[PDB]
Design a protein around this ligand. Structure first.
Ligand SMILES: *[C@@H]1O[C@H](CO)[C@@H](O)[C@H](O)[C@H]1NC(C)=O
Ligand SMILES: *[C@@H]1O[C@H](CO)[C@@H](O)[C@H](O)[C@H]1NC(C)=O
Ligand SMILES: *[C@@H]1O[C@H](CO)[C@@H](O)[C@H](O)[C@H]1NC(C)=O
Ligand SMILES: *[C@@H]1O[C@H](CO)[C@@H](O)[C@H](O)[C@H]1NC(C)=O
Lengths: 96, 48, 49, 49, 107, 97
């Protein structure tokens, strides 16, 4: 009992420093978070593609083309962004 | 609690940066990231 | 070390796709209920956490 | 679907009965909505004529 | 002469208000760690080609390097370009004119 | 424009839309109109006043509904998203609702 006590206490202290050192043992944790973020960043960036349209920001397309023409541009942008959302959701499901 | 950082995590960190605490009187940070929202967990850190 | 949960996110389908444009929403209505499906899946994940 | 929120919940829930819980039915309080512009002074007319 | 351009050739390639981000532009830019040529007290003022752009600044001794003028033919067959310094602002000028190759104004 | 609602700030072109945001930072001679991670036009320089001015998009948070069972009672209570209570009805544009 005397030196099983010591060994225990000392070893706990070890765990402390070991972690503090810099092994981010919490790597298996960090990843998750980061992994998620990356997935978010892509989604956000995907708002700059025009998927074949003459431009990207809806406001413009609306602010340049008549409704009957708008139809085309708008629809294409819709399909593109819908696909981006779908991919994001499916990935989220898997990671879940 | 300090070895896990959010510094190089763009959207999550900058959404966590809607806590300017006075910096802008009217900051509805749910209307700044285009729908992308983050709900809070049912359990905080203190209760865990 | 074990991971237990992750970040709970949710996204405003209409805001993401047709943000603030009332001409875009009426076109989105032609695709049926995709936003509803997506919000449902995301909510399921958010509860699972 | 515009009434005490309970009603719009019943709307989204697609049933005329709801259980105990919570429901995201957000972005449903109409937006501020005006129509104006700011610009410059280009007094000179075009020679197109 | 030929010297390593340790790092130069970074100019706002845009006119959009941007802040703490990391944008990845794609345009004509001085290739890093590349080279250059020049001359010195030779008597000078030679000619040189232009490609698409010319990163160019130099040891202004006592302001002696004054203006950079263009002009492909100088038989006065093109209203090209000429820039020096006329108190208020540089003499931006265009006209196919003489292209007096060795500047002079009395001074 | 107005400076408090989705007056559609059409500053010299861009049909920017957004309540409040009487913002101010720093710019440069070329610097004219804002751009963030997602380009989200941060600020702008007015065509005929010429300054700096950012703005948050149509600024209206999200709402969910707590409930006991529909047949259990008809009472409900709504919980919003991240919104300081100060601007609740004004932050759901209560006036027209
Ligand atoms: C540039 O000049 C250096 C000599 O200073 C030479 O080593 C090199 O090959 C030249 N060309 C480059 C760096 O492209
Ligand atoms: C344009 O004219 C108006 C007069 O209605 C004036 O207030 C404004 O300052 C002018 N803007 C200029 C000259 O840029
Ligand atoms: C609602 O219906 C359930 C199912 O029969 C029942 O148990 C409950 O008592 C009802 N609510 C009220 C207030 O009676
Ligand atoms: C909400 O706004 C008021 C008014 O400025 C402020 O005193 C209060 O601290 C704000 N709420 C929070 C949680 O900061």
């Amino acid at each position: 009992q005397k030196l099983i006590a010591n060994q225990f206490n000392s070893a706990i202290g070890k765990i402390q420093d070991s972690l503090s050192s810099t092994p981010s043992a919490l790597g298996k944790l960090q990843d998750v978070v980061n992994q998620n973020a990356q997935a978010l960043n892509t989604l956000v960036k995907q708002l700059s593609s025009n998927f074949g349209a003459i431009s990207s920001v809806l406001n413009d397309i609306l602010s340049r083309l008549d409704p009957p023409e708008a139809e085309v541009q708008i629809d294409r942008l819709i399909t593109g962004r819908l696909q981006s959302l779908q991919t994001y959701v499916t990935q989220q499901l898997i990671r879940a | 609690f300090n070895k896990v950082t959010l510094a190089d995590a763009g959207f999550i960190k900058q959404y966590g940066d809607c806590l300017g605490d006075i910096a802008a009187r009217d900051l509805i940070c749910a209307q700044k990231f285009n729908g992308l929202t983050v709900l809070p967990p049912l359990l905080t850190d203190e209760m865990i | 070390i074990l991971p237990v949960s992750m970040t709970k996110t949710s996204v405003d389908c209409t805001m993401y796709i047709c943000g603030d444009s009332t001409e875009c929403s009426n076109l989105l209505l032609q695709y049926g209920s995709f936003c509803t499906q997506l919000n449902r899946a995301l909510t399921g994940i958010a509860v699972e956490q | 679907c515009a009434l005490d929120p309970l009603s719009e919940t019943k709307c989204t829930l697609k049933s005329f009965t709801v259980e105990k819980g919570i429901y995201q039915t957000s972005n449903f309080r109409v937006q501020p909505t005006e129509s104006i512009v700011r610009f410059p002074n280009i007094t000179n007319l075009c020679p197109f004529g | 002469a030929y010297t390593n351009s340790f790092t130069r050739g970074v100019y706002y390639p845009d006119k959009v208000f941007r802040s703490s981000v990391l944008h990845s532009t794609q345009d004509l830019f001085l290739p890093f760690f590349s080279n250059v040529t020049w001359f010195h007290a030779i008597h000078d003022n030679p000619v040189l080609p232009f490609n698409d752009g010319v990163y160019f600044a130099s040891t202004e001794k006592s302001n002696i390097i004054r203006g950079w003028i263009f002009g492909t033919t100088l038989d006065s067959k093109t209203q090209s370009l000429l820039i020096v310094n006329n108190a208020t602002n540089v003499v931006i000028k265009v006209c196919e004119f003489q292209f007096c190759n060795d500047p002079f104004l009395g001074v | 424009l107005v400076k408090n609602k989705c007056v559609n700030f059409n500053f010299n072109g861009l049909t920017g839309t957004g309540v409040l945001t009487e913002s101010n930072k720093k710019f440069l001679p070329f610097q004219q109109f804002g751009r963030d991670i997602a380009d989200t036009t941060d600020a702008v320089r007015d065509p005929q006043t010429l300054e700096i001015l950012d703005i948050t998009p149509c600024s209206f948070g999200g709402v969910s509904v707590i409930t006991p069972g529909t047949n259990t009672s008809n009472q409900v209570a709504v919980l919003y998203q991240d919104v300081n209570c100060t601007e609740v009805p004004v932050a759901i544009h209560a006036d027209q609702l």
